[PDB]
Design an enzyme around this catalytic site. Structure first.
Site, mmCIF file in Angstrom:
data_model
loop_
_atom_site.group_PDB
_atom_site.id
_atom_site.type_symbol
_atom_site.label_atom_id
_atom_site.label_comp_id
_atom_site.label_asym_id
_atom_site.label_seq_id
_atom_site.Cartn_x
_atom_site.Cartn_y
_atom_site.Cartn_z
ATOM 1 N N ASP A 128 0.845 -1.201 0.000
ATOM 2 C CA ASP A 128 0.000 0.000 0.000
ATOM 3 C C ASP A 128 0.881 1.251 0.000
ATOM 4 O OD1 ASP A 128 -2.192 1.687 0.048
ATOM 5 O OD2 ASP A 128 -2.937 1.046 1.996
ATOM 6 N N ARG A 132 -0.042 9.071 1.121
ATOM 7 C CA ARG A 132 -0.782 8.974 2.387
ATOM 8 C C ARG A 132 -0.133 8.044 3.432
ATOM 9 N NH1 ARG A 132 -3.532 6.230 -1.415
ATOM 10 N NH2 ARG A 132 -3.544 3.997 -1.031
ATOM 11 N N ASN A 133 0.653 7.071 2.964
ATOM 12 C CA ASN A 133 1.365 6.134 3.828
ATOM 13 C C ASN A 133 2.874 6.391 3.938
ATOM 14 O OD1 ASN A 133 -1.033 4.716 4.552
ATOM 15 N ND2 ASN A 133 -0.953 3.596 2.615
ATOM 16 N N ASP A 146 3.866 1.824 7.731
ATOM 17 C CA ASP A 146 2.834 0.773 7.651
ATOM 18 C C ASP A 146 3.028 -0.286 6.554
ATOM 19 O OD1 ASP A 146 1.274 1.758 9.930
ATOM 20 O OD2 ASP A 146 1.067 3.525 8.683
HETATM 21 C C1 LIG Z 1 0.356 6.332 10.267
HETATM 22 C C2 LIG Z 1 -0.794 7.184 10.802
HETATM 23 C C3 LIG Z 1 -2.102 6.852 10.396
HETATM 24 N N1 LIG Z 1 -2.283 5.759 9.539
HETATM 25 C C4 LIG Z 1 -2.409 4.492 10.011
HETATM 26 O O1 LIG Z 1 -2.382 4.264 11.213
HETATM 27 C C5 LIG Z 1 -2.507 3.343 9.108
HETATM 28 C C6 LIG Z 1 -2.306 3.282 7.754
HETATM 29 C C7 LIG Z 1 -2.439 2.014 7.218
HETATM 30 C C8 LIG Z 1 -2.711 1.061 8.135
HETATM 31 S S1 LIG Z 1 -2.830 1.736 9.691
HETATM 32 C C9 LIG Z 1 -2.894 -0.416 7.836
HETATM 33 C C10 LIG Z 1 -2.941 -0.658 6.321
HETATM 34 C C11 LIG Z 1 -1.897 0.204 5.610
HETATM 35 C C12 LIG Z 1 -2.286 1.679 5.740
HETATM 36 C C13 LIG Z 1 -3.199 7.598 10.825
HETATM 37 C C14 LIG Z 1 -3.024 8.681 11.676
HETATM 38 C C15 LIG Z 1 -1.747 9.029 12.103
HETATM 39 C C16 LIG Z 1 -0.616 8.290 11.683
HETATM 40 C C17 LIG Z 1 0.712 8.755 12.190
HETATM 41 C C18 LIG Z 1 1.680 7.891 12.637
HETATM 42 N N2 LIG Z 1 2.895 8.321 13.082
HETATM 43 C C19 LIG Z 1 3.893 7.311 13.468
HETATM 44 C C20 LIG Z 1 3.157 9.653 13.117
HETATM 45 O O2 LIG Z 1 4.230 10.095 13.507
HETATM 46 C C21 LIG Z 1 2.092 10.573 12.679
HETATM 47 N N3 LIG Z 1 2.374 11.935 12.736
HETATM 48 C C22 LIG Z 1 1.493 13.031 12.683
HETATM 49 C C23 LIG Z 1 0.150 12.995 12.295
HETATM 50 C C24 LIG Z 1 -0.601 14.160 12.264
HETATM 51 C C25 LIG Z 1 -0.020 15.381 12.602
HETATM 52 C C26 LIG Z 1 -0.782 16.690 12.589
HETATM 53 C C27 LIG Z 1 -1.998 16.553 13.457
HETATM 54 O O3 LIG Z 1 -1.809 16.501 14.657
HETATM 55 N N4 LIG Z 1 -3.240 16.473 12.955
HETATM 56 C C28 LIG Z 1 -4.379 16.333 13.878
HETATM 57 C C29 LIG Z 1 -3.545 16.538 11.516
HETATM 58 C C30 LIG Z 1 -2.313 16.503 10.589
HETATM 59 N N5 LIG Z 1 -1.112 17.105 11.212
HETATM 60 C C31 LIG Z 1 0.038 17.329 10.314
HETATM 61 C C32 LIG Z 1 1.312 15.418 12.963
HETATM 62 C C33 LIG Z 1 2.059 14.267 13.002
HETATM 63 N N6 LIG Z 1 0.958 10.071 12.224
#
Ligand SMILES: Cc1c(NC(=O)c2cc3c(s2)CCCC3)cccc1-c1cn(C)c(=O)c(Nc2ccc([C@@H]3C(=O)N(C)CCN3C)cc2)n1
Length: 266
Positions: A128, A132-133, A146
């Site tokens: 995948d 987005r990933n 992931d």
């Molecule tokens: C990887 C991830 C996901 N995705 C998944 O968990 C999955 C994807 C797939 C799965 S599970 C199984 C099949 C294959 C596809 C969702 C939400 C956050 C993070 C995530 C993980 N990690 C390890 C991070 O460091 C991270 N960082 C992060 C996210 C958001 C923001 C920040 C925010 O706080 N918001 C609320 C919106 C966006 N923004 C930039 C800042 C850092 N996000």
């Protein structure tokens, strides 16, 4: 060795939701930044994942998101990983304020290509791969997230090739026609990811549905050159989309090609 004590975790911020539910930012032992997947009940093949997590703990590369461990004594189970402060690559690309230079875009492709070449060397498919990933850290380094976890998803809309959450627009003809997954389906997806980067997060085939995309790529239609991609960069992404899987490059070859274009266009 794989098991983190959840009592060592301090939860601080909501990071959003993914295929397995909520993800949070926190601290491990009051000091070290971590991300925590809280695995929603019924979303994962948990026993299978846990046995695989033992193997995934041996996968380590600078451009792969680092698994730190799992919490599997209680439900929901937790997946603990490296924290990536700038979030997902797709949203990062879509923020026009960054006004990325083309060298920075090519560096993002290289970051991903290095991770994928590492996974290729360990005979491990992503399945995948897409913007987005991928995640972005506070230094702007892109890392692949992931990898392999598609195998443990229990959601038929994700898993079925005609499901609403299936990555149709990142899939080669042999995946869509016959479910032939291989290194070369990841190669195809990587080409699409390069296109996403150079398109600053546009949807691939934005004017088509999934159904129309599937039929068009079976007929030999392809994505075309993003405005910000040089002819040399476009040649690299396009090479990932050969109809015949065995004519697509390896990640090692793609890495050499990207490095060559960096020397030619920087
Ligand atoms: C990887 C991830 C996901 N995705 C998944 O968990 C999955 C994807 C797939 C799965 S599970 C199984 C099949 C294959 C596809 C969702 C939400 C956050 C993070 C995530 C993980 N990690 C390890 C991070 O460091 C991270 N960082 C992060 C996210 C958001 C923001 C920040 C925010 O706080 N918001 C609320 C919106 C966006 N923004 C930039 C800042 C850092 N996000």
């Amino acid at each position: 060795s794989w098991e983190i004590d959840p009592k060592d975790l301090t939860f601080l911020k909501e990071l959003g939701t993914g295929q397995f539910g909520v993800v949070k930012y926190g601290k491990w032992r009051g000091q070290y930044d971590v991300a925590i997947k809280m695995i929603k009940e019924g979303s994962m093949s948990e026993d299978e994942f846990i046995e695989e997590a033992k193997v995934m703990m041996n996968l380590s590369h600078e451009k792969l998101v680092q698994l730190y461990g799992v919490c599997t004594k209680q439900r929901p189970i937790f997946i603990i990983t490296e924290y990536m402060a700038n979030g997902c690559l797709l949203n990062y690309l879509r923020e026009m304020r960054h006004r990325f230079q083309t060298q920075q875009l090519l560096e993002m492709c290289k970051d991903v290509c290095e991770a994928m070449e590492y996974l290729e060397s360990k005979q491990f498919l992503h399945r995948d791969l897409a913007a987005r990933n991928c995640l972005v850290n506070d230094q702007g380094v892109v890392k692949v997230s992931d990898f392999g976890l598609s195998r443990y998803v229990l959601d038929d809309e994700y898993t079925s090739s005609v499901g609403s959450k299936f990555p149709v627009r990142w899939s080669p003809p042999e995946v869509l026609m016959y479910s032939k997954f291989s290194s070369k389906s990841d190669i195809w997806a990587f080409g699409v990811l390069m296109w996403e980067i150079y398109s600053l997060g546009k949807m691939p085939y934005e004017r088509f549905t999934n159904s129309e995309t599937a039929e068009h790529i079976a007929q030999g239609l392809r994505l075309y050159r993003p405005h910000l991609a040089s002819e040399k960069v476009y040649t690299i992404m396009y090479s990932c989309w050969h109809e015949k899987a065995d004519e697509r490059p390896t990640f090692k070859i793609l890495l050499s090609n990207i490095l060559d274009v960096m020397d030619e266009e920087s």
